[PDB]
Amino acid sequence: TSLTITEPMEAFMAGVLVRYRKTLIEKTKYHLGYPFNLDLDYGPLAELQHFAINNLGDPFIESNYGVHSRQFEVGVLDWFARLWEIEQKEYWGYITNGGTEGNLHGILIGREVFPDGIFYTSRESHYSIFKAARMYRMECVKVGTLINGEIDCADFKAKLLSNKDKPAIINLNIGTTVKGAVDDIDLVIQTLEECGFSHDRFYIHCDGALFGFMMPFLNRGPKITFKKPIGSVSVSGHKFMGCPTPCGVQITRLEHINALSRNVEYLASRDATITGSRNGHSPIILWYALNRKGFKGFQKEVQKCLRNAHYLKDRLREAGISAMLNELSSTVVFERPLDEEFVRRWQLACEGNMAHVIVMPNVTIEKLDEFLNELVQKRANWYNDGKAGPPCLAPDIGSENCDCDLHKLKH
Amino acid sequence: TSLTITEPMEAFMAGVLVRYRKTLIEKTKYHLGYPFNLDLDYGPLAELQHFAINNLGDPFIESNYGVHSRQFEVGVLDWFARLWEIEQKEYWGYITNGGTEGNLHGILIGREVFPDGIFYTSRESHYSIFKAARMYRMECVKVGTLINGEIDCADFKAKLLSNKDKPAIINLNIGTTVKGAVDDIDLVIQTLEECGFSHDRFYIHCDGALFGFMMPFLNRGPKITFKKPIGSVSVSGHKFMGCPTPCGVQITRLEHINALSRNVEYLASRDATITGSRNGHSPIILWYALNRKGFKGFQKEVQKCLRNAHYLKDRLREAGISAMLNELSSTVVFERPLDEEFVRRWQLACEGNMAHVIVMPNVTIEKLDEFLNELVQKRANWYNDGKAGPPCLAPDIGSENCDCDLHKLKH
Ligand SMILES: [Zn+2]
Ligand SMILES: [Zn+2]
Ligand SMILES: [Zn+2]
Ligand SMILES: [Zn+2]
């Protein structure tokens, strides 16, 4: 709970670090709950930990602080711009400290385009989104959600129509935290158009912390492209790509950044970021990864993760455990384990009667089998004899996906 | 300007990293302008770059994500609480991604204590402060500054008195960016009291990005202590202590955090941070440093830096170069070099007619001599023959510190 700092040792401290490394190997082995790629292969870059790298200021305007990684950073941003179909001279962006910063930036951009804008996001938006709205003092209208976690564009439509006067700022979830739903970009855009909102009276941010990275590697789904009238897209680098430290990529339209960007004389750069000092090792790490693997290495990794999710779901239903997997998802929602020591061991994320597993590149079939074997074994003790019987997840995941004493019958 | 990412190499990429390491050694050698300690000695911790460490959530409430460094983080926060004289059960805080996040958090805390609060900060506050005020939609009253960069408590008094009705939220600069001034905490507090503001109608944040760390190691100055009615203090970890990546420490009063802190079920933790995912290598790095050096190692390092600043200033005045150093400062303000290739080589920060050198632990007498020898040599070419004569820095640093053709006479 605390490692106290005492006054002057190198055997004590190397003792601690040996012990600690041990626990991190254990934790890394059993981690299944959170969307972090734990297969980190950046051993050559670790030398660079000798430098105080700081990308302080604009990625595209070099500051007087010379210990930076802008060549890498700009490399990576260009790749992301290509990925989301925006040209060099149409886009601006930066490597962030994570999905939260991408969301704070994107929503702030939208506010500056439309200071009077009403803000809309689904009920299953990440907590960062509602935090942003409160930080920024924006009126937030929570939009309903279908069973699977997608924004409800009928409820969206309704809500739009009762604020016809004002501009709409929208956050769309490309892979919701709990259920792994993907908001229908195309349908949201259509709904705006047929409610009388033209491009120049709405701003959309796409929160793609995990799945915004993954979706472009599939042939399907509501493609993320600035050929459509979206404003900004963020992803998290420590989620799908994998990074020792949290990071992200935020990409917007250049015309949008002018309202945030101010000159700062003592930097000889501009400030258009949430942050000041910025992590300059992240850009190198992500550059390294993009180069080694390319679009075809990432595609493979994405496809294997969807397959491994499919597999886990199948085995759970087979075991008569309520479980759901959305079409565009590596997140397997399932009946929350009753044993909370079990939850803590596999580091499961839980909400109400749901838990979930996120099938990151590190998450192998071998590991899923270990997991299932343990789950099925312990589960036998939870709902048998005169005890309750499994919870009903039909309200959360649909009755088609529920295997309680009632809904299992209908399959 | 860009290192393009191409599709599949390990000789090309290790070629790039050899080249790049070279430039970072060069940059590290000549860096003088920014407040980053470049003497990083954390080579043993670099193994830990193999792990996706994430302190996601509250430092004091463990989340279900197990790959974290809370033992280290909490260790470090406790040390900082001791340092600023606040008890375990009176304080909350976290390790941030830098001084900007500390400021965003602190100012946001103050807003939640006083939603109607008028916000006050000096004209020489960091850009993060004015950014925060705009992000948060807070009315910001810029307070004047004495020549040396300290907040002007007469102008403060005046400004307070014309907003007697509303609470006061104040940012105080403990080491302003450009001039290295320290706002007079004690005098600000007195001014509030004699203007009719009792403790429970003002909130103070101390921005101590560089000097909040350094000041406690001196026997003098407006001591930073929660025994006085301050609300929150931030420092930057990559400034004085030194860290490969930007980080910081934000420490507030526990009673203050309740308004920001919300439970997040899927984490099994609380969200009271600006961020979500948080860097978990930083806490280890700062823990390592605090343990190896202790209060007595840091004191020594602080004292040497003040001495080396004193030295640089003296040699500049000797060379008839306008220069100033505040009493509680390692930042040497001086006539801005006319040669902007020279500015770029020593990575100097510049504002108007001022440049500055920040004497971080890495900045040795040997290095300062190299610098001065070059400066004096080139300067001989700038203001001689029929050309202008040096600029006057008296408006910026005081006529006592100016060595232009006019003010040098009066000394
Ligand atoms: Zn199937
Ligand atoms: Zn059911
Ligand atoms: Zn002297
Ligand atoms: Zn003068």
- Going by DSSP bridges, is the β-strand pair B323-325/A118-122 parallel, antiparallel, or unpaired? unpaired
CB < 8 Å to A104, chain B: 274
Whether A231 is in a domain gets the answer: yes
Are B215 and B276 members of one domain? yes
Q: Calculate the CA dihedral of residues A67, A71, A75, A81 and round it to 10 degrees.
A: 80
Q: Within 10 A of B266 (CB to CB), how many other CB atoms are there?
A: 21
Whether A279 is in a domain gets the answer: yes
Written as six digits, the tokens of B242 are 């030194």
Q: What is the DSSP letter of B182?
A: B
Domain housing A156: 45-292
Whether A10 is in a domain gets the answer: no
Are B255 and B306 members of one domain? no
Are A211 and A339 members of one domain? no
Q: Which of A176, A59, A179, A194 is nearest to A129 (CA)?
A: A176
Q: What CATH code is carried by the domain that includes residue B168? A: 3.40.640.10
Whether B317 is in a domain gets the answer: yes
Are B252 and B237 members of one domain? yes
Q: Is B329 a catalytic residue?
A: yes
Whether A13 is in a domain gets the answer: no
Question: B284 to chain A: nearest residue by CA?
Answer: A17
The answer to whether the CB atoms of B2 and A78 lie below 8 A apart is yes
Are B115 and B171 members of one domain? yes
Q: B66 CB contacts (<8 Å, ≥6 apart)?
A: A27, A30, A31, A344, A347
Q: Is the Cα torsion angle B251, B254, B256, B262 positive or negative in sign?
A: positive
Q: What CATH code is carried by the domain that includes residue B372? A: 3.90.1150.10
The span from the CA of A323 to the CA of A316, in Å, is 7
Resolution, Å (one decimal): 2.5
Residues B359, B361, B364: CA angle, nearest 5 degrees:
70
Determine the longest span between alpha carbons in chain A, in angstroms: 73
Q: Calculate the CA dihedral of residues A237, A239, A241, A242 and round it to 10 degrees.
A: 90
> What one-character-per-residue DSSP string does B297-308 give?
HHHHHHHHHHHH
Query: Per DSSP, which regions of B284-373 are E strands?
Result: 323-325, 331-335, 349-351, 354-358
Q: Are B301 and B242 in contact (CB under 8 A)?
A: no
What is the enclosing helix (H) or strand (E) of A236?
strand A232-236
Q: Which of B128, B199, B110, B189 is nearest to B157 (CA)?
A: B189
Q: Are B273 and B94 in contact (CB under 8 A)?
A: yes
Q: Helix A127-136 crosses helix B127-136 at what angle (to 10 degrees)?
A: 100
Q: Calculate the CA dihedral of residues A119, A123, A124, A125 and round it to 10 degrees.
A: 20
Are A178 and A213 members of one domain? yes
The span from the CA of B221 to the CA of A163, in Å, is 55
Are B261 and B356 members of one domain? no
Interface-testing mutation among B22, B64, B279, B342, with chain A (most A C-beta atoms within 10 A) = B64
CB < 8 Å to B348, chain A: 64
Q: What is the DSSP letter of B144?
A: P
Are B312 and B234 members of one domain? no
Residue at B52: amino acid letter: A
Whether B27 is in a domain gets the answer: no
The span from the CA of A342 to the CA of A371, in Å, is 10
Method in brief? X-ray
Whether B253 is in a domain gets the answer: yes
CA of A307 from ligand 1 middle (Å) equals 9
- Going by DSSP bridges, is the β-strand pair B331-335/B269-271 parallel, antiparallel, or unpaired? unpaired
Residue at A6: amino acid letter: T
- Going by DSSP bridges, is the β-strand pair A269-271/A331-335 parallel, antiparallel, or unpaired? unpaired
Which contacts qualify for B394-400: CB closer than 8 Å, 24 or more apart?
B395/B147, B396/B147, B396/B179, B396/B333, B396/B352, B396/B353, B396/B354, B397/B147, B397/B148, B397/B179, B397/B322, B397/B323, B397/B324, B397/B333, B397/B354, B398/B147, B398/B148, B398/B324
What's chain A's length in residues? 411
The answer to whether the CB atoms of A54 and B238 lie below 8 A apart is yes
In angstroms, the first-to-last Cα distance of chain B is 47
Distance from CA of A152 to the nearest CA of B (A): 22
Whether B9 is in a domain gets the answer: no
Residues A331, A332, A333: CA angle, nearest 5 degrees:
110
Are A92 and A173 members of one domain? yes
Are B210 and B338 members of one domain? no
Residue at A154: amino acid letter: A
**Residue B327 to residues A126, A257, A277, B179, B307: CA-CA distances in angstroms?**
47, 40, 26, 11, 11
What is the enclosing helix (H) or strand (E) of B118?
strand B118-122
Query: Helix or strand or coil: residue B165?
Result: coil
Domain boundary among B292, B313, B339: B292
Question: A354 to chain B: nearest residue by CA?
Answer: B266
Residues A276, B278, B126: CA angle, nearest 5 degrees:
20
Written as six digits, the tokens of A180 are 């792994």
Backbone phi and psi for residue B221, each to the nearest 5 degrees, phi listed first = 90, 170
Residue at B3: amino acid letter: L
Query: Helix or strand or coil: residue B335?
Result: strand
Backbone phi and psi for residue B348, each to the nearest 5 degrees, phi listed first = -80, 140
> What one-character-per-residue DSSP string does B93-108 give?
EEEESSHHHHHHHHHH
Q: Within 10 A of A168 (CB to CB), how many other CB atoms are there?
A: 24
Question: A56 to chain B: nearest residue by CA?
Answer: B246
Q: Are B271 and B264 in contact (CB under 8 A)?
A: yes
The span from the CA of A295 to the CA of A241, in Å, is 12
The span from the CA of A235 to the CA of A79, in Å, is 13
Phi-psi region of B85 (alpha: psi -120 to 50; beta: other; left: phi over 0): left
Return the ligand number nearest the Cα of B406: 4
The tally of CA atoms less than 13 A away on the side-chain side of residue B119 is 26
Are A112 and A127 members of one domain? yes
Which contacts qualify for B117-121: CB closer than 8 Å, 24 or more apart?
B117/B166, B117/B167, B117/B168, B117/B169, B117/B203, B118/B163, B118/B166, B118/B167, B118/B168, B118/B169, B119/B169, B119/B170, B119/B171, B120/B156, B120/B159, B120/B160, B120/B168, B120/B169, B120/B170, B120/B171, B121/B170, B121/B171, B121/B172, B121/B173
Q: Are B223 and B339 in contact (CB under 8 A)?
A: no
Distance from CA of A400 to the nearest CA of B (A): 24
Q: Are B121 and B110 in contact (CB under 8 A)?
A: no
Distance from CA of B255 to the nearest CA of A (A): 19
Q: Which of A95, A98, A75, A78 is nearest to A87 (CA)?
A: A78
Backbone phi and psi for residue A345, each to the nearest 5 degrees, phi listed first = -75, -40
The tally of CA atoms less than 13 A away on the side-chain side of residue A302 is 21
What's chain B's length in residues? 411
Number of domains in chain B: 2
The answer to whether the CB atoms of A51 and B295 lie below 8 A apart is no
Are B304 and B285 members of one domain? no
